[PDB]
Amino acid sequence: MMILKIGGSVITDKSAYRTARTYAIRSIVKVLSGIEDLVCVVHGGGSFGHIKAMEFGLPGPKNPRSSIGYSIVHRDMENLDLMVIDAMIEMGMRPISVPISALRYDGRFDYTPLIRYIDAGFVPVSYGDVYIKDEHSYGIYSGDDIMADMAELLKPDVAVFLTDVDGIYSKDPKRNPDAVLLRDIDTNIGKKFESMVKMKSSVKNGVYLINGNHPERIGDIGKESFIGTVIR
């Protein structure tokens, strides 16, 4: 079994509100459709939740501004999600979105509906989303959070994160011409990296970070040729 997250940095233009990279969505999903053991797909939001979230005070205390922002951020995320769902349906996949915003929550989310779908043969699709954290607070659960939950619940053999760079580097490669790709990380981007390292305890054969602009690399896992990072 594989679980996989598509980063918002690769399927959206993060700098421009509600701006998708449709060709990246299509070319990633074309590859995802050939992965036989792919049981769950998560994606991030990029410019479809982070801009309105900041603008409306999410995550944060409930007030009439964040309450309206909650509606907008969730709606925007559905719009992005439907573009991923459309490409999956085109490739003959059997996707079904299960938003975090629709799950029971008591401090952790009741994912029973995603598990039921996996058992019935669907590929549940979920994404970084708003939720009601408590009677006076709205949270944002990111796609990395959801991936950590899914690792713990499913104990998949492999987890893949797609971002818009080749892997985890020593430093942000966009700022730092001298940054070096880290091919292999052991268990003994900072927030993302922490939770990936922590996922490895639930993922038998590796948590990978791969360039979503090179989705074909998912199939090079194991080969010399492989370009990417593995946490192992």
Ligand X SMILES: C=C(C)CCOP(=O)(O)O
User: Which residues sit at the interface with ligand X, rule CB under 6 A?
Assistant: 8, 44-46, 49-50, 53, 73, 77, 128-130, 140, 142-144
For a copy of itself, the binding residues in 88-107 under the rule CB under 8 A are: 88-89, 92-99, 101-104
Per partner kind, with CB cut-offs from 5 to 8 A, the member of ligand X, ligand ATP, a copy of itself, none near residue 101 is a copy of itself
Give the Cα-Cα-Cα angle 205, 118, 87 (nearest 5 degrees).
90
Work out the burial of residue 209: count CB atoms within 10 Å of its CB; fewer than 13 is exposed, 13-18 middle, 19 or more buried.
Answer: buried
**Structure-token pair, residue 146:** 């959801």
Binding of ligand ATP at residue 169 (CB under 6 A)? yes
Strands 137-141 and 129-134 turn out to be antiparallel
Stretch that binds ligand ATP, among 33-41, 67-75, 77-85, 172-180 (CB under 6 A): 172-180
Work out the burial of residue 127: count CB atoms within 10 Å of its CB; fewer than 13 is exposed, 13-18 middle, 19 or more buried.
Answer: buried
**Structure-token pair, residue 222:** 């194991």
Find the binder of ligand ATP among 85, 140, 164, 207 (CB under 6 A). 164
DSSP secondary structure code for residue 104 in this structure: -
Find the binder of ligand ATP among 124, 128, 156, 206 (CB under 6 A). 128
C-alpha–C-alpha distance, residues 172 and 76, integer Å: 28
C-alpha–C-alpha distance, residues 218 and 213, integer Å: 11
Of the candidates 157, 164, 214, the one whose C-alpha atom is nearest the C-alpha of residue 36 is 157
List, as residue ranges, the binding site for ATP: 5-9, 46, 164, 169-174, 192
Residues that bind ligand ATP in the complex, under the rule CB under 6 A:
7-10, 44-46, 128, 142-143, 163-165, 168-169, 171-174, 189, 192
Residues that bind a copy of itself in the complex, under the rule CB under 8 A:
62, 67-68, 70-72, 74-75, 78-79, 82, 85-86, 88-89, 92-99, 101-104, 110, 112-113, 116-117, 119-122, 132, 135
List, as residue ranges, the binding site: 5-9, 45-46, 50, 143, 164, 169-174, 192
